[PDB]
Subunit: 431 residues, 4 copies
């Protein structure tokens, strides 16, 4: 059973709590799109673990590379190069858009965002950073100072020079222009404000292509592009955080490629390590060079570690080779339909959005008022689990809670439907 008192005792005894509620179960294992409790119940994993596992749990491929490097070239002195590392950096420069040339191999996405931030500060000679008001970039310093969806209160001043502008939100729009959501004018309008608040030290703007934690918010057609122009105009970099959007999830190797808009620095992590702690940043050779004349430093213990580097390559590989970017479009599409189908059955389903295998369903009391469904969201969520389907709901202020659906790119068709089905059920029971 999931009841091991000792387990729970200790769990109670020795764990720091750091957010949310602990799932009442004891996950004994995980394969493909499933995890299994201490009872052996298979739980359909619709979040790809913590939104990482892009090949699912325990993909034989990773298992091979892993074992392999673990016993061959594990960890090294940060100033010693090895193959995996050069291979990965290169691949990366290779599969990323033009203008992305050099990479830095780290461990976490907050980390990756910090590396990025420091780098723009170093190169602009500036310190002011701007993000979305519903952004999420990490638990650490800069990353954290740029994070607005949550975690700002009770932990001291943020980093000097932190600003945020509202994010273009077609579902709950608030900027009218001639009777329409002129989200482009919003942009303008925000920036003029920011402009007015600047000490004249704009260094960058950081952004998630689709705000995951912020509620699956997709930057509307032309935004990014407009955005980019905003930075360029003010001598700021545009850092694109693809911790969740990167690596095929949205149906392209990289979300920014959808807009055909390439940032100054791009950052990767979750989907890159596919469950393992590997992160990275990528930038143009020009920016790198300058960072370099300027002494850029971001030296870590695991910066450039063979084993981790090994793993992302393999991932990368697999991805390509299995055409998972596309598999993600297919299934992503299969899922949507299903979602809309439930949306047809159920009124509380106020919205179906996202891209690829990254969708969110917004819960409302009534479509007409788009009034957030309080408690409802979680009942559904709660019921899913009973039903043996793992899910994730996000609740910000101002909006119905959002289920964040992000199943493995290796997910199967059947797997899809199943989720879909348990969901309708859970919606059924939940009302």
């Amino acid at each position: 059973l999931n009841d091991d008192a000792t387990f729970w005792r200790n769990a109670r005894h020795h764990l720091v709590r750091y957010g949310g509620t602990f799932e009442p179960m004891i996950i004994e294992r995980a394969k493909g799109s499933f995890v299994y409790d201490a009872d052996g119940r298979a739980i359909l994993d619709f979040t790809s673990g913590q939104m990482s596992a892009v090949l699912g749990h325990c993909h034989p491929e990773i298992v091979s590379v892993i074992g392999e490097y673990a016993g061959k070239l594990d960890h090294l002195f940060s100033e010693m190069l090895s193959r995996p590392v050069v291979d990965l950096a290169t691949r990366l420069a290779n599969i990323t858009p033009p203008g992305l040339d050099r990479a830095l191999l780290l461990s976490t996405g907050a980390e990756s965002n910090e590396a990025a931030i420091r780098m723009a500060k170093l190169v602009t000679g500036k310190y002011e950073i701007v993000g979305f008001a519903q952004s999420w970039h990490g638990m650490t310093g800069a990353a954290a100072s740029a994070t607005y969806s949550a975690g700002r209160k009770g932990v001291g001043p943020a980093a000097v020079g932190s600003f945020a502008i509202p994010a273009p939100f077609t579902y709950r729009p608030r900027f009218e222009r001639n009777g329409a959501y002129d989200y482009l004018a919003e942009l303008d309008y925000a920036f003029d404000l920011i402009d007015r608040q600047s000490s004249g030290n704009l260094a960058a703007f950081i952004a998630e292509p689709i705000l995951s934690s912020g509620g699956i918010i997709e930057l509307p057609d032309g935004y990014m592009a407009a955005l980019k122009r905003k930075c360029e105009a003010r001598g700021m970099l545009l850092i694109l955080d693809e911790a969740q959007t990167g690596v095929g999830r949205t149906g392209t190797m990289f979300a920014c490629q959808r807009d055909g808009v390439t940032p100054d620095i791009l950052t990767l992590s979750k989907t890159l390590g596919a469950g393992l702690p590997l992160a990275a940043i990528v930038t143009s050779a020009a920016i790198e060079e300058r960072a370099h004349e300027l002494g850029y430093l971001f030296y870590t213990t695991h910066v450039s570690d063979p084993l981790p580097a090994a793993v992302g390559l393999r991932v990368l590989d697999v991805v390509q080779r299995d055409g998972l970017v596309a598999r993600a479009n297919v299934m992503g599409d299969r899922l949507r339909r299903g979602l809309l189908d439930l949306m047809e059955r159920f009124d509380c389903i106020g919205d179906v959005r996202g891209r690829g295998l990254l969708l969110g369903v917004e819960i409302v009391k009534d479509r007409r008022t788009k009034e957030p469904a309080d408690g409802l969201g979680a009942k559904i969520t709660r019921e899913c689990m009973n039903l043996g389907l793992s899910m994730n709901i996000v609740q910000l202020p101002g909006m119905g809670g959002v289920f964040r659906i992000a199943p493995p790119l290796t997910v199967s068709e059947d797997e899809i439907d199943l989720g879909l089905s348990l969901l309708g059920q859970a919606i059924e029971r939940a009302l």
Copy 2:
């Protein structure tokens, strides 16, 4: 050969530079206390990789656990518990001093320091942090704002409320009291200054038991204790960073245990993951509880990941079981002697210090002036490599450069001597 032009081309083409110089070689593998280039030359690893590898490269044990979890329970949703995790947290609460009860399982040491910092801020309601002027805590935000040994310039204001006090340095003392280094009075004296600079928002003091990057600086007899009293007095926590000192390196499971002084939060990483990216913090159940009433949040992708958690346990295990804490005292002692022996041969050897398997040798032009040996340090360093022994020199302002010697706790006797020998040679050639 180490000459693969393509390798170097790409390396040149696609790598972000983030500090130092890249070793001109191509590390093909690593076992026990050695790494091996593309030619097959075995290089004696005196830094334990990036000061992590406490069981050396590719310890069969880790290789087993690793493979094992990789294929069984890899990565999970941050809000789902598993065995490795509870086991590790517990062990940890167990092998740490009394008063350390609950743990948080993360990935990096900067990370771990950030988690810690936020936590004191959250619990004190304050934001001012104080470290040593030659401190090193990480590349990220808070960690970085607390880091004084290096990296402060050209990247914007630091975090609000950052201060530093000089570190008790017996080798290059600057505080006289009745014709002696009254480092205790220094303490007092600094603090009164800090006190005077505070907005009245002292939240914590963060410190490395022995300043590694700062030049292997050991907090003198009674310091820590005195220090602790300084915090307690001002309602501040004392966070102890044992990224390098922790886990047996200094000859105790934990350096703070040497002083018999237990901090408010302790942080682990390098030596904990033994090469792999695993980190942690540990705190009292009281502090945890409060952090918790207060909403402490530090949610990550890899917070509480089975595979990594798995690995540290094994490490931990091995350590105990192989009595490596002690092996570290033994060999650590074997090494020192040797060091002093060279010190007997060579005048440029101004100082031999450290603890356990963490020693540093300070290079001077003359013992009498303790004038840093410029270029010398690196020649030696350079020559070691030729000799096929990996080493690390640190050069701060004000002091002869320091070799930081930190070989695996699994290092052999012979291995020791060998290093020792190549070193004398390298010193010989270097003069």
Copy 3:
């Protein structure tokens, strides 16, 4: 002549420049609504000096009190009370709205704003301050960090926690709601943003009733009130800066009295000292009491100085007694008409706004595009002077430049017209 080479030499030799252009003349004297150059040309003063002189230059009354105290009770030890001081504080508590009880007697408006700011910080336990994006509060620290109309660049980070929201601007509105300027929704909308940027440390909002330097921007009907509710809602004070609006200029003793909305702290200076350096703040007895349990400190050299205190009382007096608050409505009205009249003659006159004897005329290229008239504004300005009428134009980004008309409350009818006339002329010549 205005040509004294020596004068100009020295002027060139020894003056720090601190903004704008120096009037090419040598003001020998000033009486009533006029200043006179070294040639004896009388210059009609439409700005009340630097927008202070509310009784004009050298009002016999002030001259009496001044002389008087100068020779009786000049300056004292900040901790010694005298009559003028208690009298003034009282009057003030008396002529200000209910809820304004205790006063602090200082010297400048920046000063006064600083005293205010510290006081809210002290009492809320918070540090975040919010102003208008086109605000002006002073050259000093906090005042300066809250100032957005200008002076933010090249002088370092601003004070931690500084934000701004756009100001309700009916002339160049940018917030649509159902095809109308819903400036109320703007409010809401801004605040939600701010809310999202807060570290949870909102202490206050500071605001000019009518943005003087920002272009004579009058807070639209219901704004203030709405605003106040915004603060109250978030536990913030509302500080009202009446450096220019206070003391009868807008046609009420205090602008806030127009809205019938009373702030947490009110600040006075320019119009209070009527040319002399006297400033003040006023707050409720409750806020004062608390500031006091909390150790509020704002001790100066001239805090509570008899002579200055003497002067404001007299002013105050005179004002009442001469019913200048009303005289300001009358003439203020006389002026407007005239303005609109010119507005009838001249298209470049895009807008006539303000209150009382505080009006501004916005210069545009064409009414239809409201495109700022570049150079034009200054020609007019330039021509006025030729014509022997002193004027002031303000030019922010985004809007036609604004003449800021603020003649003495003691101005005469004829005086009015004259200005009016020289203005039409100057407009005539300027096109």
Copy 4:
């Protein structure tokens, strides 16, 4: 009587409290070295009011100029020059040391310090400011962020980049070097610390020649000079705050002239306005020019106001003409003797220090322990008043309280003795 209930009622009713205790009396007038209560008791003014009145109360000269300008050229538009202004700026450039060329005419000393600070920030492109730990510069922003003697707690973060170093204190020295107070090494030692804390943004160091509020602390022989070299070395300005030291008080027109060391910017206020609110800064023509290419702005209401400008000139004049700089040495000397004489009588008199007519007497329990005399200081103080002599005691942490004696430069011999005498009495009664 001093008992006017109404007076006290209102006083209670409507005064903001801003530090200290209100003298229980009602000052009806003030002439020469005296103030007089509502009973007519003459109180010997040993603090020159709030340490300003350098010609005493109501000097006929000021009374003349004052009346004069009040009725001729009172206040003007900040961008209009007049005689007094150019005259004063010039005089000033004239009586100040070489290298001080251009002046800015403001109203307060905090103001003056702010103007200064912004100016160094503007010209260095930096933002970090460094002062003494027992400094006092003003109640406002920057001034306040640089103030360490007091007022730092409970009012939010200070300005970004604020540091302090201990002040050279011969009376309670804490820096030993070979058994002596090597205050020079202290300097060095502090700076190395600061250096280590800098983000690399040192813009200036600000300092009082003699720390008035900090306890009459005189920068020891060679300090200033050493100091200056410290700045020059790091590209920082040295701003000298002579609010109290300036204008003849220490026995030179300017304290810095004593050291023969000229700062980058010098600031004046208290002693400059001799009771009236006039302040200023003075800088080299080079710094001014640059500030100017860079857009330096510090525009106020009273910047460059004829009346105030008029007053300081007159002061200045008088000073010269009456050879008060010297009168201050004479009497200053007369006072000291007297002080030491009491010091001979009384053990609680631990120290007699200062310069010119700026001395302080430190109260101790015993000379041997230099243990601050708690309560004692104030009894004396309290008794003085009874005796009808106004005095001021300062009590910081770590030191016996200090009477700050600063009588008018116009003080008489007899006046001196009298003070002296009431003091011995008060000491007598107080024990």
